[PDB]
């Protein structure tokens, strides 16, 4: 649909933080739409890029891809501007065929969105314990 | 046996510190069980890995191996997160044959556990004086 | 944690279907835990594989990876057993560094779990309209 300010709520370890993302256009070279947090510093923005890919003569499948990039800043003694210490990434790729109905795709999407709240996933992502 | 929280007591130069270690699963690739301190920072954890090794066509002996890794953190002026300055290691390997009884193995284990409290060893490990 | 049946609820286009997944062990060759639907046919199972990866001398980052595979069956006139016509895939990879706290990782996880319910994502995944 149309790009708009996505204001996601109830985020975090406790569940009280919010994240508002402003749209920043669609890249014409590769068809990748971008959104970022209004933090006003071009290196310290939490950003989300979403792009759907048409079929070619080499893929023949629809490919949806979502990337989330979150950098962490730190102030320094030796400089007055903060720098990027580390970044956290997330990369989701859906691959659907040329005959799939929308019920199957909504089942995959809601299965992933409900499976990222399981105790298995909140123990394997947060505390990094293998499933055992 | 079953992995469990090993809460070792009376540790240190004076003998009053305790160390509680939580289990973090068994690595399926090489059969190495891990335990670590609940310090909640994935780089600043004191960790202990124990693994027993079955005989192969190249070793034909049972091999028990215990590793202890203790990193030391330091805060910095220039960053807000602490980093690892140095690490202390320990590596114990027991090698038993295919005909050894359990009394011999308990003799080796308790000999090492009582020999790590001798004045020779607490002078050679703590103060790093050669035996002379 | 430990593998156990994961009975996910309120799934689908309408929001009323449930999916119960039974654990089927951990692969020792690569450390990939598997779960699948109890559909009793080994080719028609909706399956989910989750695996976390330790650092090596070539990656030096923790890598969590989740795969979802959903096949669709169809009966045939010419055979008595159903076959797999097509499959729907999903592949999520989290890449965290060696100094990240758990609040940042929970922020990434809950950001993705709340961002898969936005109108942008339910219009780009379901109806396949570009943004």
């Amino acid at each position, epitope marked *: 649909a149309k790009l708009e300010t996505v204001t996601l709520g*109830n985020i975090g*370890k*406790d*569940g*009280k933080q919010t994240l508002v993302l402003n749209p920043r256009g669609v890249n014409p070279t590769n068809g990748v739409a971008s959104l970022s947090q209004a933090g006003a510093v071009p290196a310290l923005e939490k950003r989300v890029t979403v792009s759907v890919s048409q079929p070619s003569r080499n893929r023949k499948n629809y490919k949806v891809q979502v990337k989330i990039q979150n950098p962490t800043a730190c102030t320094a003694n030796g400089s007055c501007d903060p720098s990027v210490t580390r970044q956290a990434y997330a990369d989701v790729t859906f691959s659907f065929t040329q005959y799939s109905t929308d019920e199957e795709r909504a089942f995959v999407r809601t299965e992933l969105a*409900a499976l990222l*709240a*399981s*105790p298995l996933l*909140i*123990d394997a992502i*947060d*505390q990094l*314990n293998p499933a055992y | 046996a079953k992995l469990e*929280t090993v809460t070792l007591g009376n540790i240190g130069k004076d003998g009053k510190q305790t160390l*509680v270690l939580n*289990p973090r699963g068994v690595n399926p690739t090489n059969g190495v069980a891990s335990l670590s301190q*609940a310090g*909640a920072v994935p780089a600043l954890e004191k960790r202990v890995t124990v693994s027993v090794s079955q005989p192969s066509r190249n070793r034909k002996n049972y091999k028990v191996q215990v590793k202890i890794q203790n990193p030391t953190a330091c805060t910095a002026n220039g960053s807000c997160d602490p980093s690892v300055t140095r690490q202390a290691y320990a590596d114990v390997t027991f090698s038993f044959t295919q005909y050894s009884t359990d009394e011999e193995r308990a003799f080796v284990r308790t000999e090492l556990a009582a020999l790590l409290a001798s004045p020779l060893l607490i002078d050679a490990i703590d103060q790093l004086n050669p035996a002379y | *944690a*430990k593998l*156990e*049946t*994961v*009975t*996910l*609820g*309120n799934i689908g286009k309408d929001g009323k279907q*449930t999916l*119960v997944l*039974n*654990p089927r062990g951990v692969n020792p060759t690569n450390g990939v835990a598997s779960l699948s639907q*109890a559909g009793a046919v080994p080719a028609l199972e909706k399956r989910v594989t989750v695996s976390v990866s330790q650092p090596s001398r070539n990656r030096k980052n923790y890598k969590v990876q989740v795969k979802i595979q959903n096949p669709t069956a169809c009966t045939a006139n010419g055979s008595c057993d159903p076959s797999v016509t097509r499959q729907a895939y999903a592949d999520v990879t989290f890449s965290f560094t060696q100094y990240s706290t*758990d609040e940042e990782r*929970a922020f990434v996880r*809950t950001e993705l779990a709340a961002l898969l319910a936005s109108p942008l994502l339910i219009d780009a995944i379901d109806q396949l309209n570009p943004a």
Partner: antibody, heavy 119, light 106 residues
């Protein structure tokens, strides 16, 4: 709506074993729900006993109990079993049953009313 | 988290109040799936608030779960007179669920 009730059992059993707790589920089915057992000692706090999950594939048995209780389910008539072999020392409780809900959702959400089983 | 503990405080009807649930060994985390149980004094229990933020359908809107600090919290906004009960806590320590003592809200 959905009302649970546990009534089977509650006799003055000698310390030898051989009793059965059972509850009947009304507003749901055991296809996508699991059931807990908790144990309120007559003046202490609650204590979790055991759990079968949805469909009966993962069973736990907290380690004061494992070996001498058995929990099972019977999908005909929608009932939930609890069959032991010994009643050793205390085992005095209003035994409640909980209905572990959906997986991202609440895990002790629609309770029973308890049966007093004295040894 | 082999044992857990909380207080037995009380409050007036005319403003908010919080309830902590402190794990004895270390801190609570996301893996400690913390959810709350409400007991009306006919020993009629009820599920109150799920693990992350969730509520049981039927629980009113003046109820929120938290991870304030190192303790699983329970914020009741404008506590009226009908929830004059005792509240129970729960943690999964990796092997078995652990319930705590009550909190006699009056």
């Amino acid at each position: 709506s959905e009302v649970q009730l546990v009534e089977s059992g509650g006799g003055l059993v000698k310390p030898g074993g051989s009793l059965k707790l059972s509850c009947a589920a009304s507003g749901f089915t055991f296809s996508d729900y699991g059931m807990h057992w908790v144990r309120r000692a007559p003046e202490k706090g609650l204590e979790w006993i055991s759990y079968i999950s949805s469909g009966g594939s993962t069973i736990y048995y907290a380690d004061t109990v494992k070996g001498r209780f058995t929990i099972s389910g019977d999908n005909a008539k929608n009932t939930l079993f609890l069959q032991m072999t010994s009643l050793r020392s205390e085992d005095t409780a209003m035994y409640f049953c909980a209905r572990r809900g959906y997986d991202g959702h609440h895990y002790f959400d629609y309770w029973g009313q308890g049966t007093t089983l004295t040894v | 988290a082999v044992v857990t503990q909380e207080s037995a405080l009380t409050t007036s009807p005319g403003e908010t109040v919080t309830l902590t649930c402190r794990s004895s060994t270390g801190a609570v985390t996301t893996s400690n799936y913390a959810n709350w149980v409400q007991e009306k004094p006919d020993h009629l229990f009820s599920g109150l608030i799920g693990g992350a933020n969730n509520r049981v359908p039927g629980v009113p809107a003046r109820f929120s779960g938290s991870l304030i600090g190192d303790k699983a919290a329970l914020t009741i906004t404008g506590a009226q007179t009908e929830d004059e009960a005792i509240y129970f806590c729960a943690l999964w320590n990796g092997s078995h669920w652990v319930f705590g003592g009550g909190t006699k809200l009056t």
